[PDB]
Design a protein around this ligand. Sequence first.
Ligand SMILES: CCCCCCCCCCCCCCCCCC(=O)OC[C@H](COP(=O)([O-])OCC(O)COP(=O)([O-])OC[C@@H](COC(=O)CCCCCCCCCCCCCCCCC)OC(=O)CCCCCCCCCCCCCCCCC)OC(=O)CCCCCCCCCCCCCCCCC
Ligand SMILES: CCCCCCCCCCCCCCCCC[C@@H](O)O[C@H](CO[C@H](O)CCCCCCCCCCCCCCC)COP(=O)(O)OCC[N+](C)(C)C
Ligand SMILES: CCCCCCCC/C=C\CCCCCCCC(=O)O[C@H](COC(=O)CCCCCCC/C=C/CCCCCCCC)COP(=O)(O)OCCN
Ligand SMILES: CCCCCCCCCCCC(=O)SCCNC(=O)CCNC(=O)[C@H](O)C(C)(C)COP(=O)(O)O
Lengths: 124, 63, 84, 220, 175, 178, 104, 88, 70, 128, 55, 459
Amino acid sequence: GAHLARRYLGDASKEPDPLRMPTFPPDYGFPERKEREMVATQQEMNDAQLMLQQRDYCAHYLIQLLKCKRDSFPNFLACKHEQHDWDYCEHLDYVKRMKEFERERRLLQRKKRREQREAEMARG
Amino acid sequence: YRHSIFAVTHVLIPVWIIHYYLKYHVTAKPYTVVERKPRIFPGDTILETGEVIPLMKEFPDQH
Amino acid sequence: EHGHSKMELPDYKQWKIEGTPLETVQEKLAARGLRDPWGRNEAWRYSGGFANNVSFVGALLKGFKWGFAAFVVAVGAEYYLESQ
Amino acid sequence: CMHAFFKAMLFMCSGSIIHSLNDEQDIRKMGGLYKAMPFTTTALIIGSLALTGMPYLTGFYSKDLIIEAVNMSYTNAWALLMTLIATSLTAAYSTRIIFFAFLGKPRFPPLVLINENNPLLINSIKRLLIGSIFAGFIISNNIPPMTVPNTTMPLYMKMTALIVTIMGFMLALELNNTTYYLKFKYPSQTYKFSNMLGYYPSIMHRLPTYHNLSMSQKSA
Amino acid sequence: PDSWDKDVYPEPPRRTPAPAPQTSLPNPVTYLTKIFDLLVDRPVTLAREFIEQQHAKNRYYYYHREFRRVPDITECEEKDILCMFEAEMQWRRDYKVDQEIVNIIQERLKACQQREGESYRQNCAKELEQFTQVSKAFQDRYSDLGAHYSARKCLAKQKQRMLAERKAAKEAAAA
Amino acid sequence: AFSAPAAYLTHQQKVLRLYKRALRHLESWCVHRDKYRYFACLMRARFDEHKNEKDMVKATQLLRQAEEEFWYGQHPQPYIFPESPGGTSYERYECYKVPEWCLDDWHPSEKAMYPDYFAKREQWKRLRRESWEREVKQLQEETPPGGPRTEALPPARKEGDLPPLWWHIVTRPRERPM
Amino acid sequence: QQERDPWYDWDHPDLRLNWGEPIHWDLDMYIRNRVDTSPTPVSWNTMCKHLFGFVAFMLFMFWVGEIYPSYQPVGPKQYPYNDLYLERGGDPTKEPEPVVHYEI
Amino acid sequence: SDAPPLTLEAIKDRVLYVLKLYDKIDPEKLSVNSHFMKDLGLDSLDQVEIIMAMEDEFGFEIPDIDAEKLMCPQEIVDYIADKKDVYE
Amino acid sequence: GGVHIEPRYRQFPQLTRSQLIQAEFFSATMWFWILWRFWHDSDAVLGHFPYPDPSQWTDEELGILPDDED
Amino acid sequence: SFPKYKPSRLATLPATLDPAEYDISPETRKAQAERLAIRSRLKREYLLQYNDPNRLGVIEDPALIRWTYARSANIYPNFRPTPKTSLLGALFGIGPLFFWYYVFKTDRDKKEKLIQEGKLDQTFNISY
Amino acid sequence: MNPFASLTLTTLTILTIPIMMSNSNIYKTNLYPNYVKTTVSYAFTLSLVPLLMFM
Amino acid sequence: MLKIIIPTTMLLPMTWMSKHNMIWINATVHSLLISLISLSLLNQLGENSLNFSLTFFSDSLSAPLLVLTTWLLPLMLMASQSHLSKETTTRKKLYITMLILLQLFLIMTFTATELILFYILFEATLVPTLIIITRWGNQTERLNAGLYFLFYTLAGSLPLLVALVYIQNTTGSLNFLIIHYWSHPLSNSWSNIFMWLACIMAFMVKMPLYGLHLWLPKAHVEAPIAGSMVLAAVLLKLGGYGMMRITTILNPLTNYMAYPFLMLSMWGMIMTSSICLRQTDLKSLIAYSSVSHMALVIVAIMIQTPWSFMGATALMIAHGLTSSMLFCLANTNYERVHSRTMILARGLQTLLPLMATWWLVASLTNLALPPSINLIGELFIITASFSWSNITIILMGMNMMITALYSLYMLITTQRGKYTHHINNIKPSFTRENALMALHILPLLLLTLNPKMILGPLY
Ligand SMILES: CCCCCCCCCCCCCCCCCC(=O)OC[C@H](COP(=O)([O-])OCC(O)COP(=O)([O-])OC[C@@H](COC(=O)CCCCCCCCCCCCCCCCC)OC(=O)CCCCCCCCCCCCCCCCC)OC(=O)CCCCCCCCCCCCCCCCC
Ligand SMILES: CCCCCCCCCCCCCCCCC[C@@H](O)O[C@H](CO[C@H](O)CCCCCCCCCCCCCCC)COP(=O)(O)OCC[N+](C)(C)C
Ligand SMILES: CCCCCCCC/C=C\CCCCCCCC(=O)O[C@H](COC(=O)CCCCCCC/C=C/CCCCCCCC)COP(=O)(O)OCCN
Ligand SMILES: CCCCCCCCCCCC(=O)SCCNC(=O)CCNC(=O)[C@H](O)C(C)(C)COP(=O)(O)O
C-alpha cells in the first residue's frame, strides 16, 4: 504494498524515501535512546568467517547454528532449535526495521502538519 | 569379477598415480596446493597449539 | 529375436458408431441433411480400453489413496511411539 | 541443481513417448497414454509437479525461495510482474503438455506398438524420479547457510507463488476444455504472435544475414 | 617441507579444530578416510621409500651459477661497443630478476586470498600493500619501453623522471 | 515423386489440391476426431455446392477467394508427417545411404566375406551391360525427332528387353539402409 | 531454393537443382542452409511492427519500473562495527567517524 | 525402432479393411481390382478422401501427383510396397 | 533386455503388471512424502512468524510528541 | 473479404495467390509446354549419361562452369566506370577507413591527454 | 594426505580412460556403451566422497 | 649454421645422381634427417643470440621459422609425388632442385646477420617459386599470376634497397647487432617519413597488406600443391620477420606513421573474412583466410609491444601449419574431382570418413579453438590491441565470429549433406594422404604443450 500506491499516486513528500532514510535525528522523538548490543566480538566473528552480509547483530545464533551443523554432521536434522533461534532473532531485526520505518513516516507526518499550521497562522 | 577387475584397473591405479604425483611432486613446490583455513568457533580446542577459545558473552536466552 | 508372430486383424463388423460422440456428430450432421462417410473408421478410438477417460484432477491424484493411507498409518505409529 | 534433475527426467519421458509412437513428436497425434503407458505417465506427472514448484519436492526448495526473494527486494516492479506472469505461464504450459499428451482419446495410427517393458528405460527414469522426489529436501537440509533468510512476510505475499500457480492451472485447464466444443473460429493476432515466437526467428534470420551476405558478394 | 624457504613463502601457524562428536552415530567420513589411507597412502609411501633409497644409492650435485657485477650503461662511453654489450647483458639479467620478484609477490597475494577465506578483504591487507609497492616500482622502471627495449632507453626514462622530480621540488620549495 | 510432372495443372487438379490442403489444415486445427469429422463434413458440403457450375470464368473466379481465405486461416503450424519434406525426420537417414559402386572399391580380403552376394552382383553387372546397349537404340528409335516433349520413359516391348534407364531406379540404397 | 518443389526428382536433391538448368547469381545465398524467401503466414511489415512494438514497449516499461521501483516498508539494514568499517577494506589507522545505530 | 517387417499381405489386408469401413462403398462388391470411378461409382473427392485415409492409416503421406492417379486397391498396395521396399 | 509384446491394431496394448505396480507405488510414494512433509513441517508452507500491523503500534514507542513540543 | 497479404523481398508471394496463373491464354500454354520440353531434353541428356555403365567419372555441367566463370573471372571485362560505381567504390572503400581513423585517433588523443595530466589510475598496469 | 585433492582429481582423470581406450578393440564391439556407462557410474560414486567431506 | 646449410646443398648432387625410381625415397629421407638436425637450433638463451659467425646468427624468432622451413620440404615432396607420376626423370629432378634451392635460400635468409645479405637472399627466394608457379601449373592463368607475384614484390623491394645503402652511408654499418646497439631516434621530417615508407612498404606488400593483396589469390590458386604450401606457410612470414627486424630504427616515427596501415589491416581483416563467406573456390577461400590472419599479424607488429610480438610469432607459425594442411586437403579432393569447386563434390564424409576427420581438425585449428597455438597468438594480439585502444576489440570480435562461420561453412558444404550422384570415381584415401595429414596435424598439438618455443625472443 500500500505504501507504494500512497507514495506514487499520492504525495511524494508525505512519505519517506528508502535511500536517504532516516532524515531526522534519533533523539528527536525521545531522549532515552538506549544503544544496541553486540554479543559476538570482532575476532570470533572473523574466525567463524560467516560472510560480510551475515555479520549483523544476529551473528551469535548463526555461530551456534554452524557449531551444531559441524558437530552433529550426519544427523542433518538434529539441531532445529538453533535454526529457530536464528530465525527468531532475524525476525526481531526485521520488526525493528519496520518500526524505524513507521517512526520516520509519522515524524514526517507531524513535521508537515506543523508546517501547514504555521503557514495558516502566518496567513491569518 | 568383472566389477572387481574394473575397480582395480580403473579406480585404484589412477588414484595411486595421482596420489603419488600430488604428495611427492606438486606439494614439493610452494603454494601449489592451498587449502581454505578451517572455521574456528568459540569453545574450540585447536589441535596444533592446544589452546581453547573462550565462550561468548552469554546472550539473554528466551524463546 | 523379432516379432514375427503372424498377427491377425480383428473383424470390421465390430466397430459401430453407437455409444460414442461420433453418434452426436452424425445426428448434428443429419440435422442439416448431411452424413459422415468415415464415421466407423475411427470407432476403435472409443471402443476398447480407450473407452474410459480420466480427468486432470484425477490424473494429478494418481496415487493419493495409498499415499494417504500410508501417511495415516505412519502418523498413528508416530503418535503411539512419541507418547511413551 | 534441482532443474537438472527434473528437466532431465522430463526429457526422458518425452523421448520415451516419441520412441513408443514411432518417432512422432506432434502432440496432436498422441492421445490417451495415461493408461496405455503408466510409468512414463507417472514420471511425467511427478516431473510436472516438481517443475511448477509444488511443496516438498525438488522444485519447491529453489523456486519458492526465488519468488520470495524477488517479492522482498529493492527491484523493478515490471521485473516482478514478469516473474509472476512467467510462473503462471509455466503452470499453464505444464497443464498443456499433460492434457494434450495423456488425457484425451487416442489419436495415433492404428498399429499400436506401445511398450515400456525394458529394464534400461525403467531404471534410468526411476533413478531420476527418486532424485526429483528427495534430492531437494536432502540437499537443502545439508548445505550450510549462505544468505540471510526471509523470516516474516505478509500472508498474501507468502502464498503468491502458489496462488499464481493455481490460477495458471485453472485458466489453462478452462481454455483447454473448450477444444471439445463444436465451434470453429479463425485465430487472433495474439495467438499468431505467440506461435511464431514473437516473429523473432523470421525477421532476425532473414534481414540481417541477407544484408550481410549480399554485401559480402557485392562490395567486399 | 624443507624444499622451499619458509621466510620467502610465509604461512600462518594453521590452527585447526579438534573433532567433537555430539551424537552417537558414526560418521562415514572417518571410515572412508581410514579405508583410503589403508588402500592408497600405504603402497604409495612404500613405493616412494623404495625410490628414495634407490636415489640415495647414487648421489650427485648441481650448482647455481654466480654472475659477477660489471660496469653499467651509465659509466659507458658513447661508441664503446664492448662495455655497452656488457651493460646490456647485465640490464637484461636484472630485468629477469625483477620479473621473478614480481611473480613471487603475486604468488603470495594469490595464496593469501585463497587461504583467508571470507575474510580476505581484511586479512590480506599486508600482501596487497606489498604488491602495490612492488608494482609501482616495476611500472616506474620498465613500463612503456617498447618491444625494442634497451638499457639506454631505461636510462633516458629515468633521466626524464628525475628531471621532472627535480623541477617539481624546485618549484614547490620556491612557492 | 515417381510420376512425371505435366506442363500445367488443370482446374480440377487445383481444386483437388485445395481440398486436400484445407482438409489437412482443418484437421490440424481441430485436434479431436469427432470435431474433425463434423467440420470435415461441413467442409465437403461447402465444397460441393458449386460442383456443377459450367462457365470457366466464374469457376476461375471461385477457387481464388477460397485460396485467399485458406491463406488467411492456414494454421501457421500445421501437422506434418515425420518423413514429409517438413517433418522432424525428413532426411534423417540420408547420411546412412551409400551408393552401390562403392562396393567396386572393396579390398579382395573384404570381398572374401560375402561371396554369394558378389557373384549375384557380377550377374547383375552383366545383365546391365547388355541391357544398356539394347536400351540406347530402343530410346533413340522411340523418341520423337527434335527432342523429347516430356520426361516420361517408355516401357519394354520385346521379350528380353528391360525398361530404359532402369539401373538407377531399380537399385536404391534403401529407405533405411542401417 | 527452399520453396522449390520438394517432391520433384531433382538431379541434386539436397540443393534442389537439375542438370543443365541456369543457376541463380546468388545460389550460395539461398542453399536451404541460409537466407530463404519462403512465404510466411503473416505479412513482413505486420511482423516487423509487432516485434518492434513489443520490444519498444518492454524497454519503455522497464525504464518506468526503474523510475517507480518496488520495496518493503523497512529501514536500512544496520551493521554493528561502524558499518563494518574494518572488515570492508580496512584502513585501520584513520579512526573513521563512528556510526551508532538506533534501537527502537 | 522395434518395427515389425510388414509384408504385402499385411498391406492388402489393411487397405481392404480401411475400404470396408467406408460406408459409401459396399463390402461385397469391392475387390482388389475393383476400380473406384467406374466399378464402384465414386467421386474424385471420394478418391482423395480415401487417399487421406490411407495416409493416416499407414503413417506416411502420398504426394498429390502420384496420389491423383491411384485408382484401384491393388495399385494402392503396389505403391505402398514400392515406397516402403517390401520384399514379399 | 525386455519381454516380447506383440502389436494390437485397434485394441488396447498389452500391459505388464510390473509396470502398473511400480507406477502406482511411486505415485503413492510421492503423495505420502508430500503429506508427511507437510504434517511434520506445516510452518514451512504457511510461515511461522506473524506479520505485525504497523498502524496498531501505539504512539508511545514511536517517538511522537502531541504536535506541540517540537 | 479478408486482410490482404503484402509480399516483401524476404517473404515472397505464394504461388496460389498469383493473378498471373489465372490469366490463361494459348500463348501461356505454349510457353509452359516449351518450358517442359527444354526441361525434358536436359533431363534426357543427363539421364543418358547417368545410366551408362562405361562412364567412370564426373558429368561435366556447363551450367556450373558458366556460373563460376561469371562470378569470378567475368567481372572486370564487363566493368565500366560510372558515377554509381565510382561513388559506391569511393564510399565503401574510403569512408570506413577514415571513420575508424577518426574514432581511434580521438580515443588515443583522449588517453594521452589524461596520461599527461596524470588522472588515469594505471595502478597494476604492468603488462602491455 | 588430505584425500580431497586426490579424489577430486581422480574423478576427472577416470572420466578420460574410455577416450584413450577408444582406439582399442572394445571400441569395435557392442560392449563399449556399457563400458562408458559403467565408467560414469564409478566416477559418480567416487566423486560422492569429496562432497561428503565438504558437508 | 653450416651443419644445416651444407646438407641442404648436398641434397642436389644426391638428387641428380639417384636412380630413376628412387628420387622420392632418398629426397624424403634426407630432408627428414635435415629437419631432425635443424631441431637443435630450438634451444635458446635469454641473452643476446646464438652468434655462429660474422655471416650467420640465430635467435628465438629465427629458430621456429627455420625448423618449420626444414620440416616443410618432406611434406611438399609427399604432396607432389602424386601429380608428377607421368613426368620424365629430368623434369622431376628439376622440380626437386627448385624445392631444394627455395629451402636453401630461405635458410640463408632467416639467419642473415647483415641487412644487405638479408635483402639479397630475400629476393633470391623469388626465382624458384616463380619457376614452380609458371612451369608446373595446371591452368592457363598461371603465367599472369606469376607476373603479378613478381612485380608487386619487386615494386615494394626496389626502394628498400635504396634506403638500405643510404643507411649504410649514414650509420656506417648494416649488421643487425651494431644497428640495435647504436640505434638513434628518427626525427619527424619529410625525408625520414619517406625513409620510413621505403623501409616498410617492401615488407607490407608480401604479408600481404589489405589493398596490396591482389597477387595472393592468383598465386595460391594457380600454383601447384607444393608451391601453394610454401607460399602459404613460409613465404608470407618473410615480410613479418623483416618488419620485426627493421622497426628497431624507425622509432619514434612508427608511433604516428602506423595509423594508415593499422586501419587498413583492422578493417581489412573484416572485409576479407566476409569475402570467405561468398566464394565458389576452396583455394580462394583458404587464400583469403590467409590474408585475414596476416593482416592481424600486421596489426600486431605495428602495435610494437612485447605481447604483440609474442602473439605475432605464435600466429605466424600456427597459420603456416594450418594453411598448409588446408591446401593439402583441398588438393586431395581436387586430384579426385578435377574441379576445385566447393559445391560439386558434396557429402564426402559418407565416402571418406577419415579424411572428414582430418577436415574437422584442420577447420577447428583454423577456427582458433583453445588451447591451440592459433588461439594463443590470437588472444595475445587481441590483448595487446585492447591495451593500445579499448575500441579495437569490437573489430576483433567481429573478425572472430566471421572466421568461425566461414570455417564451418567450408566443413559443412563439402563433407556434409547428400553425396553427388553422378560422381563415382571417389576411391578410398591412400596411405600417403593420411600420412601427410597426420604429419601436418601432430606438430601443432605437440607445440601447444611447449608454447615458449614459438613465442619469440621477448618471452
Ligand atoms: C494485480 C491483480 C492480480 C489479478 C489479475 C487478474 C487475474 C487474471 C485475469 C485474467 C486476464 C486474462 C487471462 C487469460 C489469458 C488470455 C487467454 C485467451 O483468451 O487466449 C485466447 C485469445 C485468442 O485465442 P484464439 O485466437 O481464438 O486461438 C484459437 C485457439 O484457442 C488456440 O488454442 P491452443 O490449443 O493453440 O492453445 C491455447 C493457448 C492459446 O492462448 C494464447 O494465444 C496465449 C496468448 C495470450 C495469453 C498470454 C498472457 C500473458 C500476458 C503477458 C503480456 C506481456 C506484455 C506484452 C505486450 C506486447 C505489446 C504488443 O491458451 C493457453 O493454453 C493458456 C493461455 C494463458 C492462460 C494461462 C495463463 C494466464 C494467467 C496469467 C495472466 C494474468 C495473471 C498474472 C498472475 C500474477 C498476478 C499479477 O487470446 C487473446 O485474444 C489475447 C488476450 C490478451 C492479449 C493482451 C495483449 C494485446 C495487446 C494489443 C495491442 C495494445 C497496444 C500496444 C501498443 C504498444 C506500442 C509500443
Ligand atoms: C593503395 C592501397 C594502400 C597502399 C599503401 C597506402 C599507405 C601509404 C600512404 C602514406 C602514409 C602517410 C603519408 C604522409 C603521413 C605524414 C603526416 C602528414 O601527411 O600529415 C600532415 C601533413 O600535411 C599534409 O598532409 C601535407 C602533405 C599533403 C600531400 C600528400 C598527398 C595526400 C594524398 C596522397 C595519398 C596517395 C597514396 C598512394 C600514392 C601512389 C601533418 O601536418 P604537418 O604539421 O604540416 O606535417 C608534419 C610532418 N612534418 C613535421 C615533417 C612537416
Ligand atoms: C606496392 C607498391 C609500393 C611501392 C613502394 C612505395 C614506397 C615509396 C618510398 C619512397 C620513395 C623514395 C624512397 C627513398 C629511399 C630512402 C632514402 C631517404 O630517405 O633519403 C632521403 C631522400 O628522400 C627522398 O628524396 C624521397 C623523394 C621521393 C622521390 C621518389 C617518389 C616515389 C613516390 C613517392 C610517393 C609514393 C610513396 C607512398 C606509396 C604507397 C604505396 C603505393 C633524404 O635524402 P637527403 O637529401 O640525403 O637528406 C635530406 C637532408 N639534406
Ligand atoms: C481453414 C481453411 C479454410 C478453407 C477454406 C476453403 C473454402 C473452399 C470453398 C470454395 C468452394 C469451391 O470449391 S469453388 C467451385 C469452383 N467451380 C467448380 O468446382 C466447378 C466444377 N467442379 C469440378 O470440376 C470439381 O473438380 C469437382 C466436379 C467437384 C470434382 O470432380 P471429380 O472428383 O469427379 O473429378
